[PDB]
Ligand binder design. Structure first.
Ligand SMILES: CCCCCCCCCCCCCCCCCC(=O)OC[C@H](COP(=O)(O)OC[C@H](N)C(=O)O)OC(=O)CCCCCCCCCCCCCCCCC
Ligand SMILES: CCCCCCCCCCCCCCCCC[C@@H](O)O[C@H](CO[C@H](O)CCCCCCCCCCCCCCC)COP(=O)(O)OCC[N+](C)(C)C
Ligand SMILES: CCCCCCCCCCCCCCCCC[C@@H](O)O[C@H](CO[C@H](O)CCCCCCCCCCCCCCC)COP(=O)(O)OCC[N+](C)(C)C
Ligand SMILES: CCCCCCCC/C=C\CCCCCCCC(=O)O[C@H](COC(=O)CCCCCCC/C=C/CCCCCCCC)COP(=O)(O)OCCN
Lengths: 567, 48, 48, 192
């Protein structure tokens, strides 16, 4: 399978690297071919063998023409001193005419890989592999329906849980109202001063490492379980379809929810047994590959911000901003429009970098972005007033609506620790960014306590655009390396915040998180929080500032101290 | 301390539902409880 | 160049110290002022 | 104070309507929070500003060099005063830069010391004064240089005298350069 199915992507990578390594204007053809094939490979593999054979014959003709052109160009390269030196310099930079004495190994390597893949195309192994790819292309709608069923079931479960929680809240509220009115009737026979006793009526070393790695791979399987299930059911279905395929949906009923109730095929069972047999040394790496395939999207964000962070601060920074505002706010699927815009941006940026690399008028980091974006797009395999329409979609109040607030607070705290440690002018700017971070803490608390969402969106966009345009003022590798980690922490904070925006602030979100269970750990963490100066009193004052209450400041502080002591 | 914990949690929840017309009553009960040690002894016996 | 020697006990050992003691003492004073006010309510909730 | 609070409550009795003193709220918390932000920002600010220093250059007003042989007397000594002390213009600074452009250490070392931080003295080599020599000293010079197969060394030394308005702590910084010569060698022979 590795040789007959995973080699075309490898030869595409080889073409790209050969085009990038040579700076002269002959690898421009290699880059354009790489982009075209990377876009059209899926539809190319499904067509009739003659089409691909002709296309790859055209490609090998291009390869032999470029190598022959270099061979004949060596002649003028070695007659450059007389005429070409100090004359027609633009052409000598364009073609990079240089003698050898080897230096064209990459072009020959790509030619070899081209012939090898052509021979693979001739084989029958590729024939049934193409049948398998056709089946996978067919089952896309069924996979989409399965995913939709799973997500609707999860949403319904969350809705029912929320419904029962609100029912319990209403029951508690009825209970307290009944108690207070009964007390009123009992007393029938400012108000803060009132109160009387009548309210109080009593009415052996290898095993360690192997077990640890087994636990790690079990955790990976637990993380991937849903993807494993859908992939397994889809692959079993595709196997039975292609076994049936000799020459509607009714033929698929030989056997919606994640149901395994079906017949069995011995070959799949034997394959499962065999892949269980090979758990000695590839289990962890297979689990990791399955994890990166199942997720396949957050690592695109990872690479995008690493490339924007690694020395590409000039023009890459625009593209993460779009992410923070477009990929991860609109819909749980950032979708085809975002992906095509990002990828066309990457391709145009790399071709501009290559053209500006010449003398007539990088690749390593961006090739990773290209392969990641294409791999994710392949994995997905299913597809003026619109701005205001999308803004309206951002405020609908129809999602799962979960709140995770401790996370960005912890991210901000870790950011403060990083900024404090970032000393052993950048140290001068550290003070300003520290103060504005404290201000952001205050205002995000303000936004959270009033349950506002549109204000949170406005804060998110303004904060991200400000913190990204702030890199105009950004030793570089030694001292200015904590700053990039600090920016990465800001990224994780932004991700958490925008995820919260997508969720949408569930009701009944108040009180002290740490006071959830009365265990020893909660006690210890609560005391540790109480041991940091100028936090608990500020948190009380601020909660009182933004919440809607009736007690003067001292009464609020009294109640908070009382709650903490009794807790 | 279960009774007082329930009382304070009731204060917080009646707060989070924006019915401010019970917060004063609940706070008055709490402040009166803390105004007299005899009642807090009376309020903190052991269940059977 | 020439730099004034007013730096003297620079940060990391001297002045950073003096700072940390003063911030701890002021924080303790404020925390005692704001948190401890529960025990005296017998002497302020006096209505008349 | 409790009674006065009660009376001022009676003067303006707020209704049962809650609204918890919204605007007063916004004021008081605001003042409180600024105070909390105020205090801690100050001894950091004061911590940092008290540490900020301007890189005021200290250019020596005067320079002296001397050339002494043995422990007997200085043979020669000059002092370039004002006009033989040329501070580098920026253009001279770039010139020093490209002359040592391949070498990275030279570039960083120049990049630190600004053109105002680097000067050149045009010491007048030939514009000397009379080198008096007590003839006893002269005779012993000659006799030792001719037959005394001992080792005699120079005491060549540079002193830099600073502006003393531009500070500079010690303003007579100097270093000595003592290098022994070779007897029975043409150096001592030509000196004799
Ligand atoms: C430190 C890190 C190290 C990382 C190392 C990474 C791996 C490095 C080595 C990789 C080697 C890859 C070699 C691939 C060779 C492919 C050859 C191939 O596809 O031939 C295909 C051949 C020829 O067609 P045919 O079947 O005769 O066609 C006529 C008709 N159809 C028929 O039925 O006849 O038809 C066939 O049926 C022949 C099949 C030949 C299959 C050969 C597969 C070799 C795989 C080798 C994998 C090595 C992995 C090493 C991993 C090391 C890790 C440290
Ligand atoms: C400085 C000099 C150079 C400036 C160059 C500026 C160039 C600007 C170019 C802008 C191009 C924008 C392209 C946007 C492509 C969007 C593709 C589309 O598919 O995305 C949609 C989403 O579109 C986004 O909402 C658009 C967001 C636009 C935000 C614009 C912000 C502009 C800010 C400008 C700030 C300038 C500051 C100063 C700069 C100097 C997805 O919607 P979808 O989920 O399918 O809808 C589902 C419903 N259906 C089925 C009916 C479709
Ligand atoms: C401490 C923790 C341990 C980790 C430490 C770091 C270790 C780093 C190790 C790096 C691992 C790299 C993983 C490589 C994954 C490659 C995935 C690539 O092959 O995907 C291809 C597809 O790629 C896409 O088509 C886009 C083109 C990408 C081309 C990538 C070529 C990779 C070549 C790898 C060569 C490795 C050489 C190693 C030499 C030693 C094949 O996928 P396909 O069978 O279609 O899948 C169909 C079903 N899907 C779509 C849902 C997945
Ligand atoms: C150089 C060292 C500086 C100190 C570093 C200390 C590092 C400690 C690392 C971990 C600490 C994490 C624990 C604290 C996190 C609390 C998370 C949280 O829940 O957030 C709020 C945050 O608390 C507040 O709202 C008050 C703080 C926000 C205002 C921030 C003021 C400015 C930041 C001051 C930082 C400290 C300055 C000196 C350093 C000491 C601590 C950093 C409190 O809980 P609630 O919201 O009730 O829980 C609700 C559950 N749904």
């Amino acid at each position: 399978v590795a040789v007959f199915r995973y080699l075309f992507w490898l030869v595409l990578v080889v073409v790209f690297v050969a085009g990038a390594t040579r700076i002269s204007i002959f690898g421009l053809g290699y880059l354009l071919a790489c982009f075209y094939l990377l876009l059209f490979g899926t539809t190319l593999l499904q067509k009739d063998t003659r089409a691909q054979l002709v296309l790859w014959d055209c490609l090998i003709l291009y390869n032999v023409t470029v190598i022959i052109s270099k061979n004949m160009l060596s002649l003028l390269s070695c007659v450059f001193v007389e005429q070409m030196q100090s004359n027609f310099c633009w052409v000598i930079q364009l073609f990079s005419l240089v003698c050898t004495v080897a230096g064209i190994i990459w072009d020959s390597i790509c030619f070899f890989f081209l012939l090898l893949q052509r021979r693979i195309f001739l084989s029958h192994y590729f024939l049934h592999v193409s049948a398998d790819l056709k089946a996978t292309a067919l089952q896309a709608s069924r996979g989409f329906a399965l995913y939709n069923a799973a997500n609707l079931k999860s949403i319904n479960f969350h809705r029912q849980i929320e419904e029962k929680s609100l029912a319990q809240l209403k029951r508690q509220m009825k209970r307290i109202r009944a108690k207070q009115e009964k007390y009123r009737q009992s007393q029938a026979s400012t108000v803060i001063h009132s109160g009387d006793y009548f309210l109080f009526e009593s009415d052996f070393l290898w095993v360690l490492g192997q077990a640890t790695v087994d636990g790690l791979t079990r955790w990976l399987r637990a993380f991937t379980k849903h993807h494993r299930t859908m992939s397994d059911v889809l692959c079993a279905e595709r196997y039975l379809l292609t076994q049936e395929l000799l020459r509607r949906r009714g033929v698929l009923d030989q056997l919606e929810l994640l149901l395994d109730r079906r017949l069995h095929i011995p070959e799949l069972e034997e394959a499962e047994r065999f892949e269980a047999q090979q758990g000695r040394t590839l289990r962890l790496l297979r689990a990791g590959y399955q994890c990166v395939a199942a997720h396949s999207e957050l690592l695109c964000y990872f690479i995008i911000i690493l490339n924007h962070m690694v020395t590409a601060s000039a023009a890459s920074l625009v593209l993460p901003v779009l992410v923070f505002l477009w990929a991860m706010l609109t819909i749980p699927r950032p979708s085809k429009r975002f992906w095509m815009t990002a990828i066309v941006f990457t391709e145009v940026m790399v071709v501009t970098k290559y053209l500006f690399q010449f003398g007539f008028f990088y690749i390593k980091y961006d090739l990773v972005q290209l392969m990641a974006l294409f791999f994710h797009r392949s994995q997905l395999l299913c597809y003026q007033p619109l701005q205001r329409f999308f803004h309206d979609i951002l405020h609908t109040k129809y999602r799962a609506a979960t709140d995770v607030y401790a996370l960005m607070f912890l991210a901000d705290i870790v950011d403060i620790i990083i900024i404090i440690f970032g000393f052993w002018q950048v140290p001068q700017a550290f003070l300003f960014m520290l103060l504005v971070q404290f201000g952001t803490m205050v205002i995000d608390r303000a936004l959270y306590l009033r349950k506002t969402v549109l204000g949170k969106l406005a804060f998110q966009v303004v904060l991200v655009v400000a913190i990204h345009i702030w890199m105009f003022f950004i030793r570089m590798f030694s001292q200015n390396a904590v700053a990039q980690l600090w920016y990465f922490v800001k990224c994780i904070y932004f991700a958490l915040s925008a995820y919260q925006i997508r969720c949408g602030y569930p009701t009944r979100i108040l009180g002290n998180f740490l006071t959830k269970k009365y265990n020893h750990l909660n006690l210890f963490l609560f005391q540790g929080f109480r041991l940091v100066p100028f936090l608990v009193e500020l948190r009380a004052v601020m909660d009182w500032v933004w919440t809607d209450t009736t007690l003067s400041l001292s009464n609020w502080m009294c109640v908070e101290d009382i709650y903490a002591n009794i807790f | 301390v279960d009774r007082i914990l329930k009382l304070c949690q009731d204060i917080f929840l009646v707060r989070e539902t924006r019915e401010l017309e019970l917060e004063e009553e609940l706070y008055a009960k709490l402040i009166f409880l803390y105004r007299s040690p005899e009642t807090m002894i009376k309020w903190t016996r052991e269940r059977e | 160049k020439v730099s004034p020697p007013s730096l003297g006990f620079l940060a990391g050992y001297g002045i950073v110290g003096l700072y940390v003691e003063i911030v701890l003492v002021v924080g303790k004073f404020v925390r005692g002022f704001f948190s401890e006010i529960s025990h005296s309510i017998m002497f302020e909730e006096l209505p008349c | 104070i409790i009674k006065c609070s009660r009376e001022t409550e009676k003067k303006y009795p707020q209704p049962k309507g809650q609204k918890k003193k919204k605007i007063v709220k916004y004021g008081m918390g605001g003042l409180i929070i600024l105070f909390l932000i105020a205090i801690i920002w100050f001894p950091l600010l004061f911590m940092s500003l008290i540490r900020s220093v301007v890189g005021v250059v200290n250019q020596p007003i005067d320079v002296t060099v001397t050339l002494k042989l043995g422990g007997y007397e200085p043979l020669f000594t000059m002092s370039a005063q004002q006009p033989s002390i040329v501070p580098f213009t920026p253009q001279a600074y770039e010139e020093l830069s490209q002359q040592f452009d391949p070498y990275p250490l030279a570039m960083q070392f120049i990049s630190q010391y600004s053109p105002e931080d680097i000067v050149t003295a045009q010491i007048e080599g030939s514009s000397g004064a009379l080198w008096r020599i007590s003839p006893p000293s002269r005779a012993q010079m000659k006799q030792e240089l001719y037959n005394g197969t001992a080792d005699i060394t120079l005491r060549f030394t540079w002193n830099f005298q600073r502006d003393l308005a531009k500070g500079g702590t010690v303003e007579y910084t100097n270093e000595k350069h003592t290098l022994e010569l070779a007897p029975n060698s043409t150096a001592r022979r030509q000196l004799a």
